[PDB]
Design a protein around this nucleic acid. Structure first.
Length: 70
RNA sequence: ACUGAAACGAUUGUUGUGCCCCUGGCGGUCGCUUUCAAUGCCU
């Protein structure tokens, strides 16, 4: 669930590595100014990682996690 | 296959050409090298 979000539209392209050149696209990315909320459910205690990566660009998320007590 | 795998908004580009810190202007005006003096003394 998105709690706070913002979007950046930033272009990306393929490089001209050769000295001579004769495609490209715009990504609507979710931006650094954003936070989302999820829930995990398990039969057992879980060593969840405090960093994950998502999406087309293997993009860093800080996970801060709390166990819901009985 | 994470709505996945790879992912350069890149290449070239002189803030540039012309331009007198210029034009006018008296270091000027006033001013006594002045004042005093035995070529002396004796043959």
């Amino acid at each position: 669930q998105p709690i706070h979000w913002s979007y950046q539209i930033n272009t990306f392209k393929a490089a001209q590595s050769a000295y001579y050149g004769r495609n490209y696209g715009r990504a609507k990315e979710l931006a650094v100014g954003s936070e989302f909320l999820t829930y995990i459910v398990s039969q057992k205690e879980l060593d969840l990682p405090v960093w994950i990566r998502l999406g087309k660009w293997s993009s860093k998320i800080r996970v801060e996690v709390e166990a819901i007590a009985p």
